[PDB]
Amino acid sequence: IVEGSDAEIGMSPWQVMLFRKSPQELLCGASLISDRWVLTAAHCLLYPPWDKNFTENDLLVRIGKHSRTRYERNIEKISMLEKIYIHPRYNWRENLDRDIALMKLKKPVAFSDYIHPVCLPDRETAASLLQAGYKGRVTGWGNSVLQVVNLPIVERPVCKDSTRIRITDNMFCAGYKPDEGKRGDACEGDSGGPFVMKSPFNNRWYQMGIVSWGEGCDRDGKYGFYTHVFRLKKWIQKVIDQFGE
Template sequence: PYEFPWQVSVRRKSSDSHFCGGSIINDRWVVCAAHCMQGEAPALVSLVVGEHDSSAASTVRQTHDVDSIFVHEDYNTNTLENDVSVIKTSVAITFDINVGPICAPDPANDYVYRKSQCSGWGTINSGGICCPNILRYVTLNVTTNQFCEDVYPLNSIYDDMICASDNTGGNDRDSCHGNS
């Protein structure tokens, strides 16, 4: 538990239901996919940090109201280019051993062919029911964008996208709906 202290569950206040994932940047900001946040009203969304098992009581869990949501101004709903947003919390997130910010990648490094991990409460299989109670993760290899273009010839792959795969050509291990 708590292997990913930066993990955020983005939830609808009306049902307390998870609909997207995010990562803590600092004590007031969370990064999330734009396709999750476009059109969302801050008053209707909450952020849960310090979560591992959503069905269990927790002394670590913190729930935060949202002050504001900023979707990238060049986000394209058709191509998913610039699919990023930032969310400002109403009050600061309290950091401890189980809750903290993600480390930003060094832009000088090329991460192709390195292992990466994707975590979240997204569906376990395509078309499956969202969401499992336990935070899950998968280890994938960062691949070249050309690899993704070859595998997904009908999709546009842009430089701001990260392509990852299990390198087997299969789809048994991947992120899924709700992990964004």
């Protein structure tokens, strides 16, 4: 995150940090959708060109962390992974189409004031909220506490013209008109993290997207691009129902 603001305590309880065990390294952001399931971007786990090829035993996640430098005993929790699931049609050689993955924890995590799951959208929610101009929220680390930025969804024709990458219906893009001031930006480093929106119908937070790649921030590009969560909800539901419990 760049040009963002300090998040308030417990403001993003579904925030998850994906780490490589050795050497210890923060790989990506992720999100909690249940006591045993975490959502992230596939490219965080599988990207051959850069030898990014992990199995469940190479990683771990930390949940409930507000500070990236201070160890919050009794608050933050560590969870090991039981299994990883990558969308069978995930395309990394071309455009990151269907850039999504699920990770099942070895043991259920205990919810608290700092650890709570986010909701996945249904048809009504997606249809009403995923429109140009409507703002969503992205959380990550500045580049010290968790940072936050609110960003407007961009018209699809505009998104397509702002990148050389082929944009599919399983993607959407957001961000400010760079020509309109020092605005916050989601960054490549925020990959895997959630893009959330609060429903005005039931006041619940829904994860509408997953940071797939960012062309602004530390590059001369314009927007951040996201995996369209609702468009892939059938796969998500299929996996949890078949391998959950």
